[PDB]
């Protein structure tokens, strides 16, 4: 069967068949969260999940590998009977990570899905070994500002009481402090409190990089400071407004999300931080202009000398645009990979067209793929989308501090 | 029971209970369309629909009217047994129209829901009487540019073969012609063809107001030209860019949608055109800047002397903003009611807060309530919403030319 979807700009029609392979405006709906266990994954659930994955994998090549396909089926089964689980071949993992990314309905850069570097840290055992792996990560991805997509996969959930887990929301992330006002990133107020509760030394700034809070093999969490030589940053200049530097703003160059779970073949890797690179509006519009974060918009408004007291003047529409201009300009001047949202949007549309011919669909969350400024000016606004959870997948998780033992 | 929803800006939480009273990114999903019948509405369906409505109605006052409530229950029933349907008291209709509007999940102006003027034309019998009613409408609403919300309700669907139906998508709407290119509003190309097929005289302009194509008591459709004295328009001036007038643009002042069905109390009024007033971005961003309509954006780009050949320059973000500035400025100069999207957004948020205390919910379609430019700058972006179909309701319908008999 299938579902007809229309792009209202080009008038083009597309038929979705891929949604049949799905599973069972809210930001964190339960359907997108994968929570804790306290007992291993039942064998009858696990086995056909594994068999299906192994078939996806061996079903991806141009030349079938029916011998090793058949061999890997038996091998995987025998392993599950004898050990109660299994381990993925390195190529399987690589394939899983790119696939899960391919299946991230809230991501706009998925034209890049087969261009990812994978770090196998499935043999990590302690917090300090995590912290070293994360440091290798931050350094590989950052590449002196020529950002590279990478993921570090840590040991899979086994029984569920030995979970490896980054407590951070992103690898680099500015601290936010309540004050004697709020200084820094107000979004990380509660998490900053947590770092302080665990002995981290607050420096009370607007751009103080938070510490990695790591938990290995179910252990209690240990606090690590990131070597500032590793954290690359971009100071904000506007290419015509000389006064923009006086706002004294910067942002980190590495958008690396830390707290999501990779589901694959019946397995769960609750620690698999990954990174892409920035799309300007994340910093320009969300980080700098959300009232709940930094909230510069009224100030850039006042310094442009606009009528910031009458909404019908569209001064907000003029301010934010220049801020976006600041960010894109500052990233290019200092050689840090970035993409403006117009370009990203056209890129995604190309991807979708490629994904529909290749496999008859592309899961997509309109509410996320449309930029937070200039919606209908981008082509993604006009494209109808179906949103569905396939496998593998990157799920959200419950905040570990609400469930630590 | 209930559902928890978060506003991520204020951090405020709201509990939705109203969704329990619901019924059974795609623009026209079937769940939002109410199509044709060929036999009357079965009595067993109709009766509890009517009883429920009558209870909603008599349940709305501060002082109960239990006698007339009870009386109206019997009266309505007796009428349905004897006549196979019923007729609403004028106050019932008024109440129904405002309620259905209150229940329009894709509308942003609903703080105005109890401020509507109702024209009872349920006794219309012929096309010419429709056309006169529509003319009274256009004239009342337009009010010399001080726009007033109004609706004209025509006779309810009875058997389903005598349906009253406006074939227009809106009352005022510019024509679009294929050319020896495309001139005018490309969105109304197919409908313009239809008007021409029925004898209307094409004038081949960019802003030629289309004719009302009316169908009464199931009859074939008759074509009427709207008296230009009734169609009020705003010519576009930019208050700093002298060259904006040379684009030679204007738009009509009356946004009046013609083709939706009012469902109420088991009844269907397939002809009930209504109007509000404009929110700038409809004209500024959609009508003028959608590639599929008018598509001025590259031209205003070139005349601003911006680098319209490099997307990372954000020239699209600068152009569109000024166009929005043109529209808002031209409507105010010429005394035509209009509202900018920042203001509308704050207005809706106030409404939602009022709707949740008053009746524990507000149906809402995020994908529609968020303006097509400057999403996260408006508060509506950050508010989680639940979208559900209540009753009464304004449904979409199937294009009548695909089903005319
Ligand atoms: C393999 C993992 C992965 C990689 C690599 C990846 C690479 C990239 N991404 Fe992107 N992307 C990935 C998976 C996601 C997820 C799962 C989400 C949504 C997560 C969430 O709920 O916050 C996401 N990406 C979300 C986003 C968002 C929006 C985030 C937000 O607004 O909060 C952007 C702009 C984005 N991406 C762009 C990009 C770009 C550009 C690249 C590089 C080409
Ligand atoms: C009682 C009927 C009704 C009235 C009166 C009404 C009055 C108003 N409205 Fe609004 N509104 C109504 C019911 C709707 C519907 C049913 C829709 C969506 C219809 C559709 O699918 O195209 C809608 N309104 C849609 C809209 C839209 C978006 C339309 C689009 O993008 O295509 C806007 C901007 C809007 N309104 C604003 C307003 C304003 C401002 C007022 C005046 C206060
Ligand atoms: C409430 C609403 O879902 C929320 O604000 C969403 C909107 N769409 C988004 N889209 C992206 N890319 N990132 C976000 O954080 C959000 N937030
Ligand atoms: C495909 C997508 O649903 C479509 O472009 C929608 C998006 N949201 C909208 N919102 C409004 N107000 N009006 C519209 O026409 C649309 N179109």
Tab-separated table of C-alpha atoms in Angstrom, chain B residues 59-241:
chain	number	residue	atom	x	y	z
B	59	UNK	CA	-25.350	24.668	29.517
B	60	UNK	CA	-23.554	27.875	28.548
B	61	UNK	CA	-25.408	30.409	30.600
B	62	UNK	CA	-24.712	31.603	34.170
B	63	UNK	CA	-28.434	31.277	34.924
B	64	UNK	CA	-29.759	27.892	33.760
B	65	UNK	CA	-32.983	27.862	31.740
B	66	UNK	CA	-34.067	24.353	32.743
B	67	UNK	CA	-37.683	24.859	31.698
B	68	UNK	CA	-36.871	25.994	28.153
B	69	UNK	CA	-33.895	23.651	28.131
B	70	UNK	CA	-36.282	20.778	28.838
B	71	UNK	CA	-38.832	22.335	26.500
B	72	UNK	CA	-36.284	22.728	23.701
B	73	UNK	CA	-35.197	19.122	24.129
B	74	UNK	CA	-38.777	17.852	23.535
B	75	UNK	CA	-39.466	20.402	20.822
B	76	UNK	CA	-36.312	19.439	18.920
B	77	UNK	CA	-37.117	15.736	19.220
B	78	UNK	CA	-40.733	16.110	18.111
B	79	UNK	CA	-39.500	18.127	15.156
B	80	UNK	CA	-37.027	15.406	14.212
B	81	UNK	CA	-39.637	12.625	14.487
B	82	UNK	CA	-42.147	14.593	12.349
B	83	UNK	CA	-39.830	16.299	9.858
B	84	UNK	CA	-36.702	14.198	9.675
B	85	UNK	CA	-34.476	17.063	10.829
B	86	UNK	CA	-34.701	20.285	12.733
B	87	UNK	CA	-34.029	23.941	12.573
B	88	UNK	CA	-31.883	25.942	14.964
B	89	UNK	CA	-33.247	28.956	16.837
B	90	UNK	CA	-31.427	32.082	15.606
B	91	UNK	CA	-29.565	32.304	18.934
B	92	UNK	CA	-28.552	28.678	18.563
B	93	UNK	CA	-26.958	29.398	15.182
B	94	UNK	CA	-25.104	32.453	16.466
B	95	UNK	CA	-23.871	30.368	19.360
B	96	UNK	CA	-22.915	27.577	16.960
B	97	UNK	CA	-20.885	29.811	14.625
B	98	UNK	CA	-18.864	31.388	17.431
B	99	UNK	CA	-18.317	27.975	19.041
B	100	UNK	CA	-17.171	26.346	15.809
B	101	UNK	CA	-14.764	29.283	15.354
B	102	UNK	CA	-13.637	28.832	18.963
B	103	UNK	CA	-12.947	25.268	17.865
B	104	UNK	CA	-10.918	26.104	14.750
B	105	UNK	CA	-7.518	24.632	15.592
B	106	UNK	CA	-5.801	26.396	12.674
B	107	UNK	CA	-6.976	29.969	13.537
B	108	UNK	CA	-4.892	32.556	15.397
B	109	UNK	CA	-7.467	35.281	16.031
B	110	UNK	CA	-9.725	33.287	18.316
B	111	UNK	CA	-9.483	35.794	21.155
B	112	UNK	CA	-12.204	37.457	19.035
B	113	UNK	CA	-14.518	34.433	19.031
B	114	UNK	CA	-17.457	36.053	20.839
B	115	UNK	CA	-17.235	39.086	18.535
B	116	UNK	CA	-18.940	37.916	15.354
B	117	UNK	CA	-21.888	39.149	13.315
B	118	UNK	CA	-24.219	36.456	11.903
B	119	UNK	CA	-26.343	36.741	8.745
B	120	UNK	CA	-29.206	34.242	8.637
B	121	UNK	CA	-29.783	33.437	4.956
B	122	UNK	CA	-31.179	29.979	5.692
B	123	UNK	CA	-34.211	30.980	3.580
B	124	UNK	CA	-32.223	31.621	0.462
B	125	UNK	CA	-33.620	29.732	-2.511
B	126	UNK	CA	-31.854	30.845	-5.641
B	127	UNK	CA	-28.355	31.803	-6.873
B	128	UNK	CA	-29.317	35.442	-7.310
B	129	UNK	CA	-30.469	35.566	-3.679
B	130	UNK	CA	-27.113	34.103	-2.636
B	131	UNK	CA	-25.270	36.694	-4.663
B	132	UNK	CA	-27.193	39.474	-2.948
B	133	UNK	CA	-26.449	38.020	0.477
B	134	UNK	CA	-22.777	37.711	-0.387
B	135	UNK	CA	-22.818	41.329	-1.557
B	136	UNK	CA	-24.409	42.456	1.708
B	137	UNK	CA	-21.697	40.460	3.406
B	138	UNK	CA	-18.751	41.933	1.540
B	139	UNK	CA	-20.173	45.385	2.235
B	140	UNK	CA	-20.857	44.873	5.947
B	141	UNK	CA	-17.485	43.267	6.639
B	142	UNK	CA	-15.453	45.770	4.610
B	143	UNK	CA	-16.955	48.816	6.387
B	144	UNK	CA	-14.771	51.272	4.510
B	145	UNK	CA	-11.610	49.472	5.700
B	146	UNK	CA	-12.521	49.068	9.349
B	147	UNK	CA	-12.977	45.332	8.815
B	148	UNK	CA	-15.634	43.464	10.817
B	149	UNK	CA	-15.822	39.708	11.399
B	150	UNK	CA	-18.995	38.307	9.849
B	151	UNK	CA	-20.562	35.115	8.565
B	152	UNK	CA	-23.477	34.475	6.203
B	153	UNK	CA	-25.127	31.094	6.910
B	154	UNK	CA	-27.061	29.607	3.950
B	155	UNK	CA	-29.671	26.725	4.025
B	156	UNK	CA	-28.477	23.476	5.734
B	157	UNK	CA	-27.857	20.290	3.769
B	158	UNK	CA	-31.086	18.309	3.801
B	159	UNK	CA	-31.080	15.222	1.633
B	160	UNK	CA	-27.659	15.988	0.242
B	161	UNK	CA	-28.738	16.511	-3.358
B	162	UNK	CA	-29.855	20.110	-2.726
B	163	UNK	CA	-26.584	21.489	-1.306
B	164	UNK	CA	-25.928	25.271	-1.351
B	165	UNK	CA	-22.254	25.786	-2.285
B	166	UNK	CA	-19.809	28.600	-3.109
B	167	UNK	CA	-17.337	27.331	-5.659
B	168	UNK	CA	-14.790	29.990	-4.720
B	169	UNK	CA	-11.993	29.339	-2.244
B	170	UNK	CA	-12.330	32.939	-0.901
B	171	UNK	CA	-14.924	35.687	-1.690
B	172	UNK	CA	-12.351	38.106	-3.044
B	173	UNK	CA	-9.536	36.347	-4.907
B	174	UNK	CA	-7.313	37.385	-7.771
B	175	UNK	CA	-7.388	35.538	-11.057
B	176	UNK	CA	-4.426	33.639	-12.437
B	177	UNK	CA	-3.917	33.052	-16.142
B	178	UNK	CA	-1.603	30.770	-18.073
B	179	UNK	CA	0.015	32.891	-20.795
B	180	UNK	CA	1.320	32.749	-24.411
B	181	UNK	CA	4.700	32.562	-18.062
B	182	UNK	CA	1.920	32.909	-15.553
B	183	UNK	CA	0.208	36.217	-14.790
B	184	UNK	CA	-1.705	36.939	-11.570
B	185	UNK	CA	-2.244	34.482	-8.717
B	186	UNK	CA	-0.996	31.100	-10.003
B	187	UNK	CA	-2.880	29.401	-7.185
B	188	UNK	CA	-6.196	30.116	-8.880
B	189	UNK	CA	-5.194	28.872	-12.367
B	190	UNK	CA	-7.498	25.885	-12.452
B	191	UNK	CA	-10.372	27.837	-10.907
B	192	UNK	CA	-9.862	30.701	-13.375
B	193	UNK	CA	-10.100	28.190	-16.165
B	194	UNK	CA	-13.418	27.055	-14.695
B	195	UNK	CA	-14.797	30.603	-14.648
B	196	UNK	CA	-13.772	31.041	-18.292
B	197	UNK	CA	-15.368	27.690	-19.195
B	198	UNK	CA	-18.621	29.132	-17.733
B	199	UNK	CA	-18.515	32.311	-19.853
B	200	UNK	CA	-16.630	34.755	-17.596
B	201	UNK	CA	-14.614	37.310	-19.536
B	202	UNK	CA	-10.831	37.073	-18.787
B	203	UNK	CA	-9.070	40.423	-18.681
B	204	UNK	CA	-5.556	38.977	-18.331
B	205	UNK	CA	-4.197	41.115	-15.465
B	206	UNK	CA	-2.125	40.559	-12.314
B	207	UNK	CA	-4.940	41.592	-9.993
B	208	UNK	CA	-8.226	40.768	-11.703
B	209	UNK	CA	-10.865	39.939	-9.084
B	210	UNK	CA	-12.533	36.573	-9.843
B	211	UNK	CA	-16.323	36.081	-10.155
B	212	UNK	CA	-18.503	34.407	-7.550
B	213	UNK	CA	-19.496	30.977	-8.922
B	214	UNK	CA	-22.629	30.064	-7.087
B	215	UNK	CA	-24.680	26.885	-6.758
B	216	UNK	CA	-28.034	26.977	-4.969
B	217	UNK	CA	-30.388	24.142	-3.918
B	218	UNK	CA	-28.161	21.659	-5.750
B	219	UNK	CA	-28.556	23.608	-9.005
B	220	UNK	CA	-25.900	24.061	-11.670
B	221	UNK	CA	-23.511	26.951	-10.984
B	222	UNK	CA	-24.205	30.517	-12.151
B	223	UNK	CA	-21.481	33.124	-12.640
B	224	UNK	CA	-21.634	36.578	-11.001
B	225	UNK	CA	-19.167	39.484	-11.226
B	226	UNK	CA	-18.539	41.400	-7.999
B	227	UNK	CA	-19.362	45.159	-8.197
B	228	UNK	CA	-15.894	46.782	-8.051
B	229	UNK	CA	-17.314	49.434	-5.709
B	230	UNK	CA	-17.543	46.657	-3.115
B	231	UNK	CA	-14.002	45.249	-3.549
B	232	UNK	CA	-11.694	47.426	-1.427
B	233	UNK	CA	-7.931	47.216	-2.104
B	234	UNK	CA	-4.622	48.429	-0.670
B	235	UNK	CA	-1.850	49.590	-3.027
B	236	UNK	CA	1.600	48.695	-1.714
B	237	UNK	CA	4.015	51.476	-0.619
B	238	UNK	CA	7.262	51.005	1.400
B	239	UNK	CA	7.817	53.927	3.790
B	240	UNK	CA	11.512	54.370	2.898
B	241	UNK	CA	11.907	52.526	-0.408
